[PDB]
PDB file of C-alpha atoms in Angstrom:
ATOM      1  CA  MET A  27      -8.141 -16.790   6.527  1.00 23.26           C
ATOM      2  CA  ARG A  28     -10.408 -15.919   9.471  1.00 20.75           C
ATOM      3  CA  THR A  29     -13.894 -14.436   9.107  1.00 18.94           C
ATOM      4  CA  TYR A  30     -15.679 -12.701  11.965  1.00 16.55           C
ATOM      5  CA  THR A  31     -19.284 -12.411  13.167  1.00 20.69           C
ATOM      6  CA  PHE A  32     -20.570  -9.089  14.469  1.00 20.59           C
ATOM      7  CA  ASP A  33     -20.803 -10.575  17.971  1.00 18.74           C
ATOM      8  CA  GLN A  34     -17.139 -11.512  17.999  1.00 18.07           C
ATOM      9  CA  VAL A  35     -16.100  -8.001  16.996  1.00 20.30           C
ATOM     10  CA  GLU A  36     -17.866  -6.344  19.912  1.00 17.49           C
ATOM     11  CA  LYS A  37     -16.691  -9.154  22.214  1.00 18.89           C
ATOM     12  CA  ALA A  38     -13.021  -8.452  21.392  1.00 17.96           C
ATOM     13  CA  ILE A  39     -13.442  -4.686  21.826  1.00 18.36           C
ATOM     14  CA  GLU A  40     -15.437  -5.015  25.049  1.00 18.99           C
ATOM     15  CA  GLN A  41     -12.706  -7.093  26.711  1.00 21.22           C
ATOM     16  CA  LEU A  42     -10.103  -4.350  26.267  1.00 23.08           C
ATOM     17  CA  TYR A  43     -12.439  -1.348  26.301  1.00 21.66           C
ATOM     18  CA  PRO A  44     -15.378  -2.064  28.639  1.00 21.51           C
ATOM     19  CA  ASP A  45     -16.230   1.652  29.113  1.00 20.70           C
ATOM     20  CA  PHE A  46     -16.662   2.026  25.344  1.00 20.36           C
ATOM     21  CA  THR A  47     -20.305   1.549  24.382  1.00 16.47           C
ATOM     22  CA  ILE A  48     -21.107   0.213  20.925  1.00 20.33           C
ATOM     23  CA  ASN A  49     -24.379   1.032  19.179  1.00 19.62           C
ATOM     24  CA  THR A  50     -24.082  -0.096  15.551  1.00 18.85           C
ATOM     25  CA  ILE A  51     -21.663  -2.219  13.510  1.00 18.13           C
ATOM     26  CA  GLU A  52     -21.361  -1.973   9.726  1.00 15.37           C
ATOM     27  CA  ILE A  53     -18.913  -3.863   7.506  1.00 16.76           C
ATOM     28  CA  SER A  54     -17.180  -0.678   6.346  1.00 17.06           C
ATOM     29  CA  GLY A  55     -14.902  -2.500   3.915  1.00 17.20           C
ATOM     30  CA  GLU A  56     -12.816  -5.550   3.037  1.00 19.97           C
ATOM     31  CA  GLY A  57      -9.276  -5.814   1.672  1.00 19.36           C
ATOM     32  CA  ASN A  58      -6.583  -8.449   1.203  1.00 21.26           C
ATOM     33  CA  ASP A  59      -5.553  -8.142   4.821  1.00 22.60           C
ATOM     34  CA  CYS A  60      -8.384  -6.964   7.062  1.00 22.23           C
ATOM     35  CA  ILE A  61     -12.151  -6.598   7.488  1.00 23.63           C
ATOM     36  CA  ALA A  62     -13.221  -3.045   8.277  1.00 25.02           C
ATOM     37  CA  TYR A  63     -16.047  -2.138  10.674  1.00 24.57           C
ATOM     38  CA  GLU A  64     -17.634   1.267  11.160  1.00 25.96           C
ATOM     39  CA  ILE A  65     -18.630   1.780  14.768  1.00 25.99           C
ATOM     40  CA  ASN A  66     -20.573   4.747  16.196  1.00 29.23           C
ATOM     41  CA  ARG A  67     -20.217   6.312  12.725  1.00 28.50           C
ATOM     42  CA  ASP A  68     -16.951   7.942  13.805  1.00 31.19           C
ATOM     43  CA  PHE A  69     -14.565   5.001  14.218  1.00 31.82           C
ATOM     44  CA  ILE A  70     -13.051   2.457  11.821  1.00 32.31           C
ATOM     45  CA  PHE A  71     -12.012  -0.861  13.322  1.00 32.92           C
ATOM     46  CA  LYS A  72      -9.793  -3.230  11.323  1.00 37.42           C
ATOM     47  CA  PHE A  73      -9.700  -6.982  11.982  1.00 40.84           C
ATOM     48  CA  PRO A  74      -7.004  -9.147  10.329  1.00 39.12           C
ATOM     49  CA  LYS A  75      -8.229 -12.005   8.144  1.00 39.54           C
ATOM     50  CA  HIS A  76      -4.895 -13.784   8.570  1.00 38.94           C
ATOM     51  CA  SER A  77      -1.515 -13.640  10.337  1.00 38.35           C
ATOM     52  CA  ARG A  78       0.331 -11.673   7.658  1.00 39.27           C
ATOM     53  CA  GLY A  79      -2.472  -9.116   7.571  1.00 41.17           C
ATOM     54  CA  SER A  80      -2.135  -8.665  11.347  1.00 45.89           C
ATOM     55  CA  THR A  81       1.563  -7.905  10.825  1.00 47.34           C
ATOM     56  CA  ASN A  82       0.725  -5.119   8.378  1.00 49.75           C
ATOM     57  CA  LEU A  83      -1.900  -3.809  10.809  1.00 49.15           C
ATOM     58  CA  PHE A  84       0.706  -3.899  13.568  1.00 47.43           C
ATOM     59  CA  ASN A  85       3.103  -2.066  11.238  1.00 43.85           C
ATOM     60  CA  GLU A  86       0.444   0.484  10.268  1.00 44.68           C
ATOM     61  CA  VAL A  87      -0.324   1.400  13.910  1.00 45.53           C
ATOM     62  CA  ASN A  88       3.374   1.824  14.782  1.00 47.75           C
ATOM     63  CA  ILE A  89       4.083   3.972  11.759  1.00 46.75           C
ATOM     64  CA  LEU A  90       1.028   6.220  12.285  1.00 45.29           C
ATOM     65  CA  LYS A  91       2.029   6.854  15.932  1.00 47.62           C
ATOM     66  CA  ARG A  92       5.471   8.020  14.759  1.00 45.99           C
ATOM     67  CA  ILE A  93       4.363  10.348  11.955  1.00 42.93           C
ATOM     68  CA  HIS A  94       0.989  11.579  13.239  1.00 40.55           C
ATOM     69  CA  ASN A  95       2.279  15.159  13.603  1.00 40.51           C
ATOM     70  CA  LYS A  96       4.668  15.279  10.694  1.00 41.51           C
ATOM     71  CA  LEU A  97       2.340  15.515   7.684  1.00 40.70           C
ATOM     72  CA  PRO A  98       0.449  18.362   5.907  1.00 38.16           C
ATOM     73  CA  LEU A  99      -2.642  16.165   5.393  1.00 36.43           C
ATOM     74  CA  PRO A 100      -4.815  14.221   7.927  1.00 35.09           C
ATOM     75  CA  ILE A 101      -3.973  10.520   8.369  1.00 31.47           C
ATOM     76  CA  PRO A 102      -5.765   7.830  10.391  1.00 28.73           C
ATOM     77  CA  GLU A 103      -5.459   8.330  14.143  1.00 27.02           C
ATOM     78  CA  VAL A 104      -5.126   5.209  16.261  1.00 26.12           C
ATOM     79  CA  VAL A 105      -7.554   5.302  19.196  1.00 22.30           C
ATOM     80  CA  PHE A 106      -8.026   1.611  19.982  1.00 22.61           C
ATOM     81  CA  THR A 107      -5.497  -1.249  19.845  1.00 24.99           C
ATOM     82  CA  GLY A 108      -5.869  -5.011  20.212  1.00 28.06           C
ATOM     83  CA  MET A 109      -3.555  -7.624  21.735  1.00 26.35           C
ATOM     84  CA  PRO A 110      -0.982  -9.990  20.181  1.00 27.07           C
ATOM     85  CA  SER A 111      -1.438 -13.802  20.182  1.00 28.17           C
ATOM     86  CA  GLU A 112       0.254 -16.873  18.725  1.00 29.69           C
ATOM     87  CA  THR A 113      -1.622 -16.184  15.487  1.00 30.22           C
ATOM     88  CA  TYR A 114      -1.851 -12.396  15.288  1.00 30.66           C
ATOM     89  CA  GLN A 115       0.572  -9.580  16.127  1.00 28.82           C
ATOM     90  CA  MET A 116      -2.464  -7.440  16.860  1.00 27.24           C
ATOM     91  CA  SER A 117      -6.046  -8.679  17.176  1.00 27.14           C
ATOM     92  CA  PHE A 118      -7.494  -5.357  15.933  1.00 32.59           C
ATOM     93  CA  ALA A 119      -7.051  -1.609  15.749  1.00 33.15           C
ATOM     94  CA  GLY A 120      -9.561   1.285  15.946  1.00 33.72           C
ATOM     95  CA  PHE A 121      -9.075   4.468  13.945  1.00 31.98           C
ATOM     96  CA  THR A 122     -10.791   7.842  13.967  1.00 34.36           C
ATOM     97  CA  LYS A 123     -13.022   7.888  10.866  1.00 32.49           C
ATOM     98  CA  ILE A 124     -11.917  10.414   8.232  1.00 33.71           C
ATOM     99  CA  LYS A 125     -14.953  11.770   6.409  1.00 31.65           C
ATOM    100  CA  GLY A 126     -14.870  11.973   2.631  1.00 33.65           C
ATOM    101  CA  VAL A 127     -14.902   9.950  -0.553  1.00 29.96           C
ATOM    102  CA  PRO A 128     -11.956   8.401  -2.489  1.00 32.84           C
ATOM    103  CA  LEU A 129     -10.530  10.842  -5.048  1.00 29.59           C
ATOM    104  CA  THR A 130     -11.187   8.540  -8.001  1.00 29.77           C
ATOM    105  CA  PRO A 131      -9.825   9.542 -11.419  1.00 28.74           C
ATOM    106  CA  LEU A 132     -13.358  10.395 -12.494  1.00 27.58           C
ATOM    107  CA  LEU A 133     -13.965  12.827  -9.615  1.00 28.62           C
ATOM    108  CA  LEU A 134     -10.575  14.481 -10.116  1.00 29.75           C
ATOM    109  CA  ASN A 135     -11.071  15.065 -13.876  1.00 30.88           C
ATOM    110  CA  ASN A 136     -14.464  16.622 -13.206  1.00 32.25           C
ATOM    111  CA  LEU A 137     -13.037  19.178 -10.792  1.00 31.21           C
ATOM    112  CA  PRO A 138     -12.386  22.781 -11.812  1.00 30.46           C
ATOM    113  CA  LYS A 139      -8.843  23.308 -13.151  1.00 30.42           C
ATOM    114  CA  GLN A 140      -7.742  25.238 -10.057  1.00 33.24           C
ATOM    115  CA  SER A 141      -8.939  22.375  -7.863  1.00 36.55           C
ATOM    116  CA  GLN A 142      -7.109  19.748  -9.870  1.00 37.54           C
ATOM    117  CA  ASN A 143      -3.843  21.677  -9.610  1.00 37.92           C
ATOM    118  CA  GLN A 144      -4.433  22.232  -5.900  1.00 35.71           C
ATOM    119  CA  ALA A 145      -4.816  18.474  -5.571  1.00 40.48           C
ATOM    120  CA  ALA A 146      -1.499  17.869  -7.313  1.00 42.08           C
ATOM    121  CA  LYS A 147       0.197  20.498  -5.136  1.00 43.36           C
ATOM    122  CA  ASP A 148      -1.224  19.044  -1.936  1.00 44.45           C
ATOM    123  CA  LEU A 149      -0.248  15.505  -2.994  1.00 44.02           C
ATOM    124  CA  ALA A 150       3.271  16.620  -3.897  1.00 44.59           C
ATOM    125  CA  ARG A 151       3.610  18.401  -0.567  1.00 45.47           C
ATOM    126  CA  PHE A 152       2.319  15.352   1.279  1.00 48.23           C
ATOM    127  CA  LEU A 153       4.812  13.087  -0.506  1.00 45.63           C
ATOM    128  CA  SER A 154       7.621  15.637  -0.120  1.00 44.40           C
ATOM    129  CA  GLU A 155       7.212  15.820   3.659  1.00 40.43           C
ATOM    130  CA  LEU A 156       6.568  12.111   3.979  1.00 38.27           C
ATOM    131  CA  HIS A 157       9.777  11.299   2.158  1.00 38.70           C
ATOM    132  CA  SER A 158      11.609  13.818   4.421  1.00 39.50           C
ATOM    133  CA  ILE A 159      10.570  12.222   7.709  1.00 40.73           C
ATOM    134  CA  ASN A 160      13.593  11.125   9.770  1.00 40.65           C
ATOM    135  CA  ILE A 161      13.876   7.314   9.398  1.00 37.88           C
ATOM    136  CA  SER A 162      16.390   7.012  12.255  1.00 37.14           C
ATOM    137  CA  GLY A 163      13.965   6.012  14.994  1.00 35.21           C
ATOM    138  CA  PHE A 164      12.181   3.679  12.606  1.00 34.44           C
ATOM    139  CA  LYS A 165      12.818  -0.086  12.607  1.00 32.92           C
ATOM    140  CA  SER A 166      14.649  -2.140  10.004  1.00 31.12           C
ATOM    141  CA  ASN A 167      12.094  -4.791   9.198  1.00 30.61           C
ATOM    142  CA  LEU A 168      10.290  -1.946   7.470  1.00 30.75           C
ATOM    143  CA  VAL A 169      13.383  -1.238   5.349  1.00 30.64           C
ATOM    144  CA  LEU A 170      12.651  -2.512   1.852  1.00 29.36           C
ATOM    145  CA  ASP A 171      15.811  -2.852  -0.237  1.00 29.47           C
ATOM    146  CA  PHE A 172      14.563  -3.387  -3.772  1.00 27.73           C
ATOM    147  CA  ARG A 173      17.625  -5.348  -4.916  1.00 27.36           C
ATOM    148  CA  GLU A 174      17.132  -7.674  -1.948  1.00 26.24           C
ATOM    149  CA  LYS A 175      13.453  -8.028  -2.897  1.00 27.65           C
ATOM    150  CA  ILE A 176      14.151  -8.844  -6.566  1.00 30.78           C
ATOM    151  CA  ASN A 177      16.801 -11.375  -5.577  1.00 30.72           C
ATOM    152  CA  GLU A 178      14.475 -12.954  -2.991  1.00 30.11           C
ATOM    153  CA  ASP A 179      11.563 -12.968  -5.416  1.00 26.92           C
ATOM    154  CA  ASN A 180      13.728 -14.734  -7.981  1.00 27.56           C
ATOM    155  CA  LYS A 181      14.354 -17.560  -5.488  1.00 25.70           C
ATOM    156  CA  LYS A 182      10.681 -17.667  -4.615  1.00 24.55           C
ATOM    157  CA  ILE A 183       9.504 -17.939  -8.216  1.00 23.21           C
ATOM    158  CA  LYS A 184      12.143 -20.591  -8.843  1.00 22.40           C
ATOM    159  CA  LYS A 185      11.110 -22.513  -5.749  1.00 23.82           C
ATOM    160  CA  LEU A 186       7.440 -22.147  -6.652  1.00 21.75           C
ATOM    161  CA  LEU A 187       7.488 -22.872 -10.409  1.00 24.68           C
ATOM    162  CA  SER A 188      10.305 -25.402 -10.755  1.00 22.90           C
ATOM    163  CA  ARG A 189       7.659 -28.114 -11.190  1.00 24.99           C
ATOM    164  CA  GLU A 190       5.260 -25.984 -13.267  1.00 28.62           C
ATOM    165  CA  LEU A 191       7.455 -24.552 -16.007  1.00 29.28           C
ATOM    166  CA  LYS A 192       9.632 -26.450 -18.485  1.00 29.10           C
ATOM    167  CA  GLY A 193      13.432 -26.054 -18.606  1.00 29.67           C
ATOM    168  CA  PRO A 194      13.758 -23.191 -21.121  1.00 27.39           C
ATOM    169  CA  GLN A 195      10.739 -21.466 -19.593  1.00 27.62           C
ATOM    170  CA  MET A 196      12.393 -21.203 -16.163  1.00 29.37           C
ATOM    171  CA  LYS A 197      15.613 -19.951 -17.797  1.00 27.81           C
ATOM    172  CA  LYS A 198      13.562 -17.307 -19.590  1.00 24.70           C
ATOM    173  CA  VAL A 199      12.269 -16.221 -16.164  1.00 22.96           C
ATOM    174  CA  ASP A 200      15.825 -16.161 -14.902  1.00 22.11           C
ATOM    175  CA  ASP A 201      16.782 -14.050 -17.923  1.00 24.07           C
ATOM    176  CA  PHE A 202      14.099 -11.495 -17.096  1.00 24.02           C
ATOM    177  CA  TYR A 203      15.311 -11.338 -13.481  1.00 23.76           C
ATOM    178  CA  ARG A 204      18.944 -11.047 -14.628  1.00 24.65           C
ATOM    179  CA  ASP A 205      18.167  -8.088 -16.934  1.00 25.72           C
ATOM    180  CA  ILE A 206      16.526  -6.279 -14.037  1.00 21.10           C
ATOM    181  CA  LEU A 207      19.398  -6.779 -11.637  1.00 21.49           C
ATOM    182  CA  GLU A 208      21.993  -5.558 -14.155  1.00 20.40           C
ATOM    183  CA  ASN A 209      20.063  -2.331 -14.568  1.00 18.47           C
ATOM    184  CA  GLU A 210      21.468  -0.018 -11.865  1.00 19.78           C
ATOM    185  CA  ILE A 211      18.639   2.490 -12.214  1.00 21.42           C
ATOM    186  CA  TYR A 212      16.244   0.452 -10.120  1.00 19.35           C
ATOM    187  CA  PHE A 213      18.515   0.312  -7.108  1.00 20.48           C
ATOM    188  CA  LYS A 214      20.430   3.580  -6.755  1.00 14.98           C
ATOM    189  CA  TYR A 215      17.688   5.424  -4.826  1.00 13.86           C
ATOM    190  CA  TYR A 216      17.900   7.224  -1.481  1.00 14.04           C
ATOM    191  CA  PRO A 217      15.838   5.130   1.009  1.00 11.76           C
ATOM    192  CA  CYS A 218      13.052   7.018   2.792  1.00 12.06           C
ATOM    193  CA  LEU A 219       9.650   6.392   4.350  1.00 13.04           C
ATOM    194  CA  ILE A 220       7.026   5.804   1.630  1.00 12.34           C
ATOM    195  CA  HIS A 221       3.316   5.024   1.610  1.00 15.82           C
ATOM    196  CA  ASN A 222       4.040   2.181  -0.822  1.00 16.87           C
ATOM    197  CA  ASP A 223       0.372   1.855  -1.824  1.00 17.54           C
ATOM    198  CA  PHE A 224      -0.247   5.454  -2.863  1.00 18.55           C
ATOM    199  CA  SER A 225      -3.322   5.103  -5.073  1.00 15.70           C
ATOM    200  CA  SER A 226      -6.674   6.772  -5.686  1.00 15.15           C
ATOM    201  CA  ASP A 227      -8.476   4.392  -3.354  1.00 16.45           C
ATOM    202  CA  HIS A 228      -6.396   5.694  -0.475  1.00 19.16           C
ATOM    203  CA  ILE A 229      -6.859   9.416  -1.139  1.00 19.28           C
ATOM    204  CA  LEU A 230      -9.960  10.806   0.552  1.00 20.35           C
ATOM    205  CA  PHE A 231     -11.607  13.936  -0.844  1.00 18.62           C
ATOM    206  CA  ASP A 232     -13.976  16.563   0.485  1.00 15.23           C
ATOM    207  CA  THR A 233     -16.562  17.236  -2.263  1.00 16.22           C
ATOM    208  CA  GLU A 234     -17.682  20.383  -0.390  1.00 15.34           C
ATOM    209  CA  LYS A 235     -14.336  22.169  -0.007  1.00 16.05           C
ATOM    210  CA  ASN A 236     -12.990  20.507  -3.182  1.00 17.07           C
ATOM    211  CA  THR A 237      -9.749  19.696  -1.367  1.00 15.69           C
ATOM    212  CA  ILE A 238      -8.055  16.458  -0.288  1.00 15.21           C
ATOM    213  CA  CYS A 239      -8.941  15.796   3.358  1.00 15.38           C
ATOM    214  CA  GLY A 240      -6.970  12.608   4.036  1.00 15.89           C
ATOM    215  CA  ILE A 241      -4.645   9.782   3.108  1.00 13.79           C
ATOM    216  CA  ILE A 242      -5.459   6.313   4.418  1.00 16.51           C
ATOM    217  CA  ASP A 243      -4.241   2.695   4.589  1.00 14.67           C
ATOM    218  CA  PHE A 244      -0.587   2.761   5.697  1.00 11.71           C
ATOM    219  CA  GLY A 245      -0.411  -1.028   6.103  1.00 13.65           C
ATOM    220  CA  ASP A 246       2.098  -1.378   3.272  1.00 14.99           C
ATOM    221  CA  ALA A 247       4.195   1.592   4.387  1.00 13.48           C
ATOM    222  CA  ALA A 248       7.953   0.984   4.338  1.00 14.43           C
ATOM    223  CA  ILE A 249      11.386   2.552   3.948  1.00 14.46           C
ATOM    224  CA  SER A 250      12.139   2.241   0.223  1.00 12.89           C
ATOM    225  CA  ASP A 251      12.209   4.002  -3.118  1.00 14.54           C
ATOM    226  CA  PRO A 252      10.336   7.377  -3.142  1.00 15.82           C
ATOM    227  CA  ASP A 253       9.566   6.855  -6.871  1.00 14.89           C
ATOM    228  CA  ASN A 254       7.222   4.047  -5.803  1.00 18.26           C
ATOM    229  CA  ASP A 255       4.698   6.599  -4.592  1.00 15.63           C
ATOM    230  CA  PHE A 256       4.568   8.270  -8.017  1.00 15.31           C
ATOM    231  CA  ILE A 257       4.349   5.180 -10.184  1.00 14.70           C
ATOM    232  CA  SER A 258       1.427   3.898  -8.110  1.00 14.25           C
ATOM    233  CA  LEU A 259      -0.608   6.939  -9.218  1.00 13.58           C
ATOM    234  CA  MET A 260       0.827   6.777 -12.735  1.00 17.13           C
ATOM    235  CA  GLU A 261      -1.334   4.042 -14.253  1.00 18.16           C
ATOM    236  CA  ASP A 262      -3.797   5.210 -16.873  1.00 19.81           C
ATOM    237  CA  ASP A 263      -6.155   2.262 -16.369  1.00 19.03           C
ATOM    238  CA  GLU A 264      -7.283   2.683 -12.782  1.00 20.53           C
ATOM    239  CA  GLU A 265      -5.307   5.742 -11.651  1.00 18.63           C
ATOM    240  CA  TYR A 266      -4.513   9.373 -12.514  1.00 19.42           C
ATOM    241  CA  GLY A 267      -2.197   8.922 -15.512  1.00 17.32           C
ATOM    242  CA  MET A 268       1.072  10.544 -16.550  1.00 18.31           C
ATOM    243  CA  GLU A 269      -0.250  14.081 -17.064  1.00 20.46           C
ATOM    244  CA  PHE A 270      -1.574  14.648 -13.536  1.00 22.66           C
ATOM    245  CA  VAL A 271       1.449  12.924 -11.994  1.00 23.81           C
ATOM    246  CA  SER A 272       3.652  15.241 -14.045  1.00 25.97           C
ATOM    247  CA  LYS A 273       2.161  18.142 -12.084  1.00 26.42           C
ATOM    248  CA  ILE A 274       2.963  16.330  -8.847  1.00 24.76           C
ATOM    249  CA  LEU A 275       6.545  15.757  -9.956  1.00 23.53           C
ATOM    250  CA  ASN A 276       6.746  19.459 -10.748  1.00 19.25           C
ATOM    251  CA  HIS A 277       5.749  20.682  -7.284  1.00 21.61           C
ATOM    252  CA  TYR A 278       7.803  17.820  -5.801  1.00 19.81           C
ATOM    253  CA  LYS A 279      10.736  19.272  -7.762  1.00 21.10           C
ATOM    254  CA  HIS A 280      11.773  15.866  -9.032  1.00 21.59           C
ATOM    255  CA  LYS A 281      15.129  16.243 -10.808  1.00 19.96           C
ATOM    256  CA  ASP A 282      14.876  12.982 -12.814  1.00 19.49           C
ATOM    257  CA  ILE A 283      11.524  12.200 -14.378  1.00 20.26           C
ATOM    258  CA  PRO A 284      12.556   9.901 -17.257  1.00 15.96           C
ATOM    259  CA  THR A 285      13.888   7.316 -14.795  1.00 14.47           C
ATOM    260  CA  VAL A 286      10.546   7.383 -12.979  1.00 14.87           C
ATOM    261  CA  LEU A 287       8.949   6.359 -16.265  1.00 13.70           C
ATOM    262  CA  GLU A 288      11.621   3.681 -16.698  1.00 15.67           C
ATOM    263  CA  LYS A 289      10.710   2.280 -13.280  1.00 16.77           C
ATOM    264  CA  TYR A 290       7.028   2.404 -14.156  1.00 14.48           C
ATOM    265  CA  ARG A 291       7.468   0.311 -17.265  1.00 12.70           C
ATOM    266  CA  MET A 292       9.472  -2.187 -15.232  1.00 13.21           C
ATOM    267  CA  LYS A 293       6.867  -2.604 -12.522  1.00 12.85           C
ATOM    268  CA  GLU A 294       4.128  -3.118 -15.096  1.00 14.54           C
ATOM    269  CA  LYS A 295       5.888  -6.074 -16.638  1.00 13.14           C
ATOM    270  CA  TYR A 296       6.753  -7.376 -13.185  1.00 14.10           C
ATOM    271  CA  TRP A 297       3.155  -7.472 -11.962  1.00 14.81           C
ATOM    272  CA  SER A 298       2.807 -10.980 -13.332  1.00 18.99           C
ATOM    273  CA  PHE A 299       5.426 -12.211 -10.867  1.00 18.84           C
ATOM    274  CA  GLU A 300       3.916 -10.174  -8.035  1.00 18.56           C
ATOM    275  CA  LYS A 301       0.603 -11.959  -8.499  1.00 18.56           C
ATOM    276  CA  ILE A 302       2.392 -15.334  -8.263  1.00 14.87           C
ATOM    277  CA  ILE A 303       4.159 -14.352  -5.049  1.00 17.81           C
ATOM    278  CA  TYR A 304       1.441 -12.218  -3.473  1.00 15.34           C
ATOM    279  CA  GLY A 305      -0.902 -15.039  -4.391  1.00 14.87           C
ATOM    280  CA  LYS A 306       1.152 -17.303  -2.148  1.00 14.76           C
ATOM    281  CA  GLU A 307       2.136 -15.075   0.719  1.00 15.59           C
ATOM    282  CA  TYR A 308      -1.352 -13.641   1.082  1.00 19.62           C
ATOM    283  CA  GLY A 309      -3.464 -16.646   0.031  1.00 20.38           C
ATOM    284  CA  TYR A 310      -5.835 -15.705  -2.799  1.00 21.25           C
ATOM    285  CA  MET A 311      -5.005 -18.505  -5.209  1.00 22.13           C
ATOM    286  CA  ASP A 312      -6.985 -16.773  -7.945  1.00 24.31           C
ATOM    287  CA  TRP A 313      -4.040 -14.488  -8.627  1.00 21.35           C
ATOM    288  CA  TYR A 314      -1.646 -17.477  -8.797  1.00 21.14           C
ATOM    289  CA  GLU A 315      -2.981 -19.057 -11.974  1.00 22.54           C
ATOM    290  CA  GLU A 316      -3.600 -15.564 -13.377  1.00 25.69           C
ATOM    291  CA  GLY A 317       0.063 -14.668 -13.189  1.00 26.64           C
ATOM    292  CA  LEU A 318       1.152 -18.198 -13.967  1.00 25.90           C
ATOM    293  CA  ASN A 319      -0.258 -18.103 -17.500  1.00 24.72           C
ATOM    294  CA  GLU A 320       1.006 -14.597 -18.079  1.00 21.39           C
ATOM    295  CA  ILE A 321       4.704 -15.363 -17.728  1.00 23.30           C
ATOM    296  CA  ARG A 322       4.418 -18.459 -19.987  1.00 23.61           C
TER     297      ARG A 322
END
């Protein structure tokens, strides 16, 4: 993982954009992929911490440029782009800053009833139009076939933990994976463009108008199961919970809710294996031992 000084940030931006004058730099945020910098209090620059994070940044920029005028809610606008190298697919990207605070479950529940329902309606409309965007012009490395993922993940876990787990333990893991693959409900979806990380941290809110004013972080966006965008908001622990999501599914006119709940229960048990794999593909070895003990 690469860390940046504040001098290096301006130095990279100045090389490509010399006529752009920088006044102040603030570490706006920090995720598993990039470091965020707020510049001129109206721009958000993302710098990849590693190669894989640069790939997601590269993917985010390309997706935003294709759907910038196809959505009912504001999304990040790309205004600056970096260059590719032997280590990064894109050195950085500058976005127009969307003003507002994350619509955390606490803020949502404190809203007037009419505002909460308006939020559900606006979210459902956003997801409805997002999942209706023509995926023809889109690439295919963004296509995420879930059956291919589960099969691939099975081989990864097996390759990773063949020297960690005992014989019957590995077979138990294989049993879990086999039960998933024989359940046709997880794979008979209609592929469409999804946000794929649709959570409260990525939903900006205007506390003045009491309406959602933006959706951010499209770095995980892909062509996959539309139900993914509902189950990511469905968690009761850190998200909105079933009741609010039910309102979304209503406006979304979802014809098959029980199978969305079935997918949700599956993903929650599967998170242990995600932490093992994500803890390898994205560094962060802390997740590795965390998920390692869980599956035992």
